[PDB]
Design an enzyme around this catalytic site. Structure first.
Site, mmCIF file in Angstrom:
data_model
loop_
_atom_site.group_PDB
_atom_site.id
_atom_site.type_symbol
_atom_site.label_atom_id
_atom_site.label_comp_id
_atom_site.label_asym_id
_atom_site.label_seq_id
_atom_site.Cartn_x
_atom_site.Cartn_y
_atom_site.Cartn_z
ATOM 1 N N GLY A 105 0.371 -7.269 0.688
ATOM 2 C CA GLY A 105 -0.708 -7.832 1.473
ATOM 3 C C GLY A 105 -2.063 -7.695 0.813
ATOM 4 O O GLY A 105 -2.983 -8.427 1.172
ATOM 5 N N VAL B 219 15.788 -6.320 -2.185
ATOM 6 C CA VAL B 219 16.837 -5.413 -1.712
ATOM 7 C C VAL B 219 17.412 -5.974 -0.427
ATOM 8 O O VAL B 219 16.657 -6.351 0.474
ATOM 9 C CB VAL B 219 16.299 -3.999 -1.479
ATOM 10 C CG1 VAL B 219 17.385 -3.075 -0.914
ATOM 11 C CG2 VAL B 219 15.727 -3.414 -2.789
ATOM 12 N N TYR C 171 0.814 -1.219 0.000
ATOM 13 C CA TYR C 171 0.000 0.000 0.000
ATOM 14 C C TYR C 171 0.852 1.275 0.000
ATOM 15 O O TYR C 171 0.646 2.153 -0.832
ATOM 16 C CB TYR C 171 -0.967 0.006 1.207
ATOM 17 C CG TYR C 171 -2.057 -1.025 1.080
ATOM 18 C CD1 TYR C 171 -1.878 -2.333 1.524
ATOM 19 C CD2 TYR C 171 -3.220 -0.727 0.406
ATOM 20 C CE1 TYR C 171 -2.843 -3.284 1.339
ATOM 21 C CE2 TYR C 171 -4.194 -1.675 0.234
ATOM 22 C CZ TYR C 171 -4.003 -2.953 0.690
ATOM 23 O OH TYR C 171 -4.972 -3.921 0.483
ATOM 24 N N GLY C 172 1.824 1.382 0.900
ATOM 25 C CA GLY C 172 2.637 2.596 0.941
ATOM 26 C C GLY C 172 3.416 2.765 -0.351
ATOM 27 O O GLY C 172 3.529 3.873 -0.890
ATOM 28 N N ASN D 175 -8.936 -2.423 10.901
ATOM 29 C CA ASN D 175 -8.052 -3.022 9.911
ATOM 30 C C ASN D 175 -7.234 -1.903 9.263
ATOM 31 O O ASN D 175 -7.791 -0.864 8.942
ATOM 32 C CB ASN D 175 -8.864 -3.776 8.865
ATOM 33 C CG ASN D 175 -9.930 -4.605 9.461
ATOM 34 O OD1 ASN D 175 -10.934 -4.067 9.943
ATOM 35 N ND2 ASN D 175 -9.760 -5.916 9.420
ATOM 36 N N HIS E 198 -1.774 -7.874 11.118
ATOM 37 C CA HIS E 198 -1.657 -6.418 11.001
ATOM 38 C C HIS E 198 -0.411 -5.882 11.733
ATOM 39 O O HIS E 198 -0.533 -5.183 12.747
ATOM 40 C CB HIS E 198 -2.866 -5.723 11.649
ATOM 41 C CG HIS E 198 -4.204 -6.176 11.184
ATOM 42 N ND1 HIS E 198 -5.342 -5.926 11.920
ATOM 43 C CD2 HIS E 198 -4.600 -6.841 10.077
ATOM 44 C CE1 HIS E 198 -6.382 -6.443 11.288
ATOM 45 N NE2 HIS E 198 -5.957 -7.005 10.163
ATOM 46 N N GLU F 198 -14.133 -8.386 14.159
ATOM 47 C CA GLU F 198 -14.828 -8.810 12.975
ATOM 48 C C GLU F 198 -15.306 -10.226 13.114
ATOM 49 O O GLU F 198 -14.681 -11.068 13.750
ATOM 50 C CB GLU F 198 -14.028 -8.522 11.785
ATOM 51 C CG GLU F 198 -14.178 -7.026 11.512
ATOM 52 C CD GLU F 198 -12.966 -6.391 10.951
ATOM 53 O OE1 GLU F 198 -11.896 -7.041 10.924
ATOM 54 O OE2 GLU F 198 -13.108 -5.230 10.530
ATOM 55 N N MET G 97 -10.953 -5.698 3.904
ATOM 56 C CA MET G 97 -11.748 -4.835 4.775
ATOM 57 C C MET G 97 -11.118 -3.475 4.846
ATOM 58 O O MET G 97 -9.955 -3.350 5.235
ATOM 59 C CB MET G 97 -11.886 -5.432 6.172
ATOM 60 C CG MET G 97 -12.733 -6.685 6.175
ATOM 61 S SD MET G 97 -12.854 -7.536 7.753
ATOM 62 C CE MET G 97 -11.337 -8.465 7.757
HETATM 63 C C1 LIG Z 1 -1.662 -11.198 5.754
HETATM 64 C C2 LIG Z 1 -3.038 -10.598 5.966
HETATM 65 C C3 LIG Z 1 -3.122 -9.213 6.147
HETATM 66 C C4 LIG Z 1 -4.351 -8.565 6.339
HETATM 67 C C5 LIG Z 1 -5.538 -9.318 6.407
HETATM 68 C C6 LIG Z 1 -5.403 -10.702 6.216
HETATM 69 C C7 LIG Z 1 -4.172 -11.308 6.007
HETATM 70 C C8 LIG Z 1 -4.178 -12.832 5.796
HETATM 71 N N1 LIG Z 1 -6.821 -8.755 6.443
HETATM 72 S S1 LIG Z 1 -7.616 -9.262 7.865
HETATM 73 O O1 LIG Z 1 -8.637 -10.123 7.345
HETATM 74 O O2 LIG Z 1 -6.664 -9.903 8.742
HETATM 75 O O3 LIG Z 1 -8.146 -8.082 8.506
HETATM 76 C C9 LIG Z 1 -6.808 -7.343 6.366
HETATM 77 C C10 LIG Z 1 -7.941 -6.653 5.877
HETATM 78 O O4 LIG Z 1 -9.096 -7.195 5.552
HETATM 79 N N2 LIG Z 1 -7.989 -5.284 5.907
HETATM 80 C C11 LIG Z 1 -6.858 -4.549 6.322
HETATM 81 O O5 LIG Z 1 -6.959 -3.254 6.423
HETATM 82 N N3 LIG Z 1 -5.621 -5.154 6.530
HETATM 83 C C12 LIG Z 1 -5.736 -6.528 6.447
HETATM 84 N N4 LIG Z 1 -4.458 -7.150 6.607
HETATM 85 C C13 LIG Z 1 -3.266 -6.317 6.746
HETATM 86 C C14 LIG Z 1 -2.818 -5.598 5.483
HETATM 87 O O6 LIG Z 1 -2.760 -6.494 4.394
HETATM 88 C C15 LIG Z 1 -1.483 -4.916 5.747
HETATM 89 O O7 LIG Z 1 -1.634 -4.018 6.815
HETATM 90 C C16 LIG Z 1 -0.943 -4.142 4.525
HETATM 91 O O8 LIG Z 1 -0.791 -4.980 3.401
HETATM 92 C C17 LIG Z 1 0.394 -3.523 4.893
HETATM 93 O O9 LIG Z 1 0.812 -2.687 3.783
HETATM 94 P P1 LIG Z 1 2.352 -2.243 3.630
HETATM 95 O O10 LIG Z 1 2.881 -1.837 4.962
HETATM 96 O O11 LIG Z 1 2.425 -1.314 2.493
HETATM 97 O O12 LIG Z 1 3.112 -3.609 3.310
HETATM 98 P P2 LIG Z 1 2.797 -4.991 2.520
HETATM 99 O O13 LIG Z 1 3.127 -6.107 3.457
HETATM 100 O O14 LIG Z 1 1.452 -4.943 1.910
HETATM 101 O O15 LIG Z 1 3.790 -4.949 1.285
HETATM 102 C C18 LIG Z 1 5.241 -5.073 1.386
HETATM 103 C C19 LIG Z 1 5.750 -5.620 0.095
HETATM 104 O O16 LIG Z 1 7.197 -5.404 0.126
HETATM 105 C C20 LIG Z 1 7.803 -6.659 -0.385
HETATM 106 N N5 LIG Z 1 9.105 -6.727 0.178
HETATM 107 C C21 LIG Z 1 9.432 -6.906 1.494
HETATM 108 N N6 LIG Z 1 10.733 -6.793 1.783
HETATM 109 C C22 LIG Z 1 11.258 -6.506 0.471
HETATM 110 C C23 LIG Z 1 12.616 -6.290 0.047
HETATM 111 N N7 LIG Z 1 13.691 -6.306 0.961
HETATM 112 N N8 LIG Z 1 12.885 -6.138 -1.224
HETATM 113 C C24 LIG Z 1 11.808 -6.131 -2.127
HETATM 114 N N9 LIG Z 1 10.514 -6.315 -1.799
HETATM 115 C C25 LIG Z 1 10.292 -6.469 -0.445
HETATM 116 C C26 LIG Z 1 6.838 -7.695 0.064
HETATM 117 O O17 LIG Z 1 7.075 -8.950 -0.653
HETATM 118 C C27 LIG Z 1 5.526 -7.074 -0.172
HETATM 119 O O18 LIG Z 1 4.941 -7.353 -1.463
#
Ligand SMILES: Cc1cc2c(cc1C)N(S(=O)(=O)O)[C@@H]1C(=O)NC(=O)N=C1N2C[C@H](O)[C@H](O)[C@H](O)COP(=O)(O)OP(=O)(O)OC[C@H]1O[C@@H](n2cnc3c(N)ncnc32)[C@H](O)[C@@H]1O
Length: 498
Positions: free
Chosen positions: A107, A242, A12-13, A477, A439, A353, A114
């Site tokens: 993620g 990285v 997301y970021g 969430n 989260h 939830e 949600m």
């Molecule tokens: C695992 C998971 C997570 C969630 C949930 C269910 C499940 C099963 N559901 S709920 O049902 O639980 O609630 C959620 C939901 O409905 N609603 C919600 O708001 N958040 C949910 N989360 C949480 C959110 O998904 C989470 O908060 C966000 O995705 C976080 O976003 P951000 O902080 O931007 O990070 P990311 O994890 O999405 O992405 C990081 C990416 O970087 C990559 N990466 C990491 N290190 C790297 C490196 N060194 N080099 C290159 N690439 C490199 C990653 O591979 C990734 O793609």
């Protein structure tokens, strides 16, 4: 070689940042350690479902695992698998396991969709240095629109078998004097209605979510990242991780980047440099890069707050056994639609939830994901021996979260004469799962490790954009908050720094 801006990760970021950079005319390279999920697999689908997990389910594991809460019914479909660049990574620390997505979209590939704004009074408590008026008047609405947030049709919800599980918990909560709220989502609810009508291929209604949705869910690859690619100024390289970050003598940044295949074999190590460097590797991934850089001497002017202030968003899972006259249904949509809002900003707060379960036969279980207000925080500490950031969190640090969840669900049990299940999370009697996290929040906290827009302290043109900025808790969430905060931050950074 050189690219003006590099963004690490594609969650997301990262996705917000890359869109806005591209629209500003800044040529931007995104580096994603996982795959672009667009190739049909052995079943003709991109992603596996929860009843048919295979190597696509897991980031470099040798056996599939059941979704948390469903081991009793889904262990039977587990199988040995080859270690592979699959979509869901369970990251195991000493007393905490954190689930994260791996792929283009992060993620957003694996989450429940949600899409919830935090309570403004709570946002003001957790981030007192940030102007809440612009967040609520401008950035939150911008995020909801770009993310394609939508709302379930209430009549369909009331009538459909696929949400009986939700109606049952609503009725039970009501007998304890607790109301429910509808939870907005990025899964297309119109599409979901057509799934139930047999008109389009099922995804939510075919036990898919945590290993990806083959249909319906508007993950970031369809929304922000598609738009970013559309600018003509953004490229994405996959299976590129990285490993190190340094400052060049003239104040740019240089990265070592490993290219692997989907079996994890190292193909090449590359140098990539840039003028502007944006970390969007997640709470775990961004924080690890920065503690490594500090403690191996490549970014020696990072401050002591790097690594600090991590929390699991108060995540706790629990379950209740329903009366035999309140079956939850064999058919449960994999996307939650209802929650219980008992969040008043006190330490007793719970936003829960009502979670579906994938078993596909009647179990009478109601499952809940509780989000609580627990002041305990962990720290990521660099281990030079293994070259890994280790999270120092102990399970007793979740006791306040368990206490708050238990108080709420004890009220529901008392009003209904029901009991907990104790057998869903292992053989030992345990009603509250207290050592997982979906989260992860913090590690590079906004205003602590960075300024109030994510500019890393000690450095110019170095930014953090993601869940690592959030101080351990948002009460809901988190992805809508991460997205909105990233909209605010990148807009300011582009105006003042670029
Ligand atoms: C695992 C998971 C997570 C969630 C949930 C269910 C499940 C099963 N559901 S709920 O049902 O639980 O609630 C959620 C939901 O409905 N609603 C919600 O708001 N958040 C949910 N989360 C949480 C959110 O998904 C989470 O908060 C966000 O995705 C976080 O976003 P951000 O902080 O931007 O990070 P990311 O994890 O999405 O992405 C990081 C990416 O970087 C990559 N990466 C990491 N290190 C790297 C490196 N060194 N080099 C290159 N690439 C490199 C990653 O591979 C990734 O793609």
């Amino acid at each position: 070689g050189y690219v003006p801006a590099v963004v690490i990760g594609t969650g997301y970021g990262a996705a917000v940042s890359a869109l806005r950079l591209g629209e500003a005319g800044v040529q931007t390279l995104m580096l994603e350690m996982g795959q672009l999920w667009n190739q049909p697999g052995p079943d003709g689908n991109i992603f596996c479902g929860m009843l048919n997990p295979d190597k696509r389910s897991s980031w470099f594991k040798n056996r599939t695992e059941a979704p948390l809460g469903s081991f009793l019914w889904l262990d039977v479909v587990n199988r040995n698998i080859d270690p592979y660049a699959g979509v869901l990574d369970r990251v195991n620390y000493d007393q905490m396991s954190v689930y994260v997505g791996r792929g283009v979209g992060g993620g957003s590939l694996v989450n429940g969709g949600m899409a919830v704004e935090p309570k403004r009074s709570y946002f003001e408590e957790i981030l007192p240095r940030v102007d809440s008026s612009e967040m609520y008047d401008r950035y939150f609405p911008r995020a909801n629109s770009m993310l394609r947030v939508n709302h379930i049709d209430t009549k369909w919800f009331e009538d459909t078998e696929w949400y009986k599980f939700a109606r049952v918990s609503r009725e039970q909560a009501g007998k304890a004097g607790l109301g429910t709220v509808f939870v907005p989502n990025v899964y297309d609810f119109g599409y979901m209605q057509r799934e139930a009508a047999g008109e389009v291929p099922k995804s939510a209604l075919a036990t898919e979510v945590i290993y990806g949705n083959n249909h319906g869910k508007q993950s970031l690859d369809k929304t922000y990242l598609a738009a970013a690619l559309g600018t003509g100024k953004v490229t994405i390289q996959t299976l590129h991780q990285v490993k190190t970050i340094r400052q060049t003598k003239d104040g740019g940044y240089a990265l070592t980047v490993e290219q692997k295949d989907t079996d994890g074999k190292l193909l090449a190590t590359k140098e990539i440099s840039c003028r502007y460097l944006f970390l969007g590797a997640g709470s775990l991934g961004s924080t690890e890069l920065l503690v490594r850089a500090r403690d191996t001497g490549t970014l020696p002017n990072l401050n002591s707050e790097v690594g600090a202030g991590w929390g699991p968003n108060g995540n706790i899972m629990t379950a209740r056994a329903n009366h035999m006259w309140n079956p939850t249904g064999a058919h449960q949509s994999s996307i939650p639609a209802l929650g219980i809002d008992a969040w008043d900003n006190s330490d007793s707060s719970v936003f829960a939830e009502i979670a579906p379960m994938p078993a596909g036969l009647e179990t009478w279980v109601s499952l809940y994901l509780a989000i609580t207000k627990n002041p305990q925080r962990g720290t990521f500490v660099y281990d030079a021996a293994t070259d890994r950031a280790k999270l120092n969190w102990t399970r007793d640090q979740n006791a306040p979260a368990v206490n708050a969840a238990k108080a709420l669900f004890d009220r529901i049990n008392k009003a209904n004469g029901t009991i907990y299940r104790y057998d869903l999370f292992g053989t030992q009697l345990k009603a509250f799962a207290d050592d997982f996290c979906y989260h992860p929040l913090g590690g590079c906290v906004l205003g602590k490790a960075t300024d109030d827009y994510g500019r890393v302290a000690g450095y110019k043109n170095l930014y953090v954009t993601d869940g690592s900025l959030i101080p351990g808790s948002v009460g809901v969430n988190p992805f809508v908050t991460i997205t909105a905060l990233a909209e605010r931050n990148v807009e300011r950074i582009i105006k003042q720094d670029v």
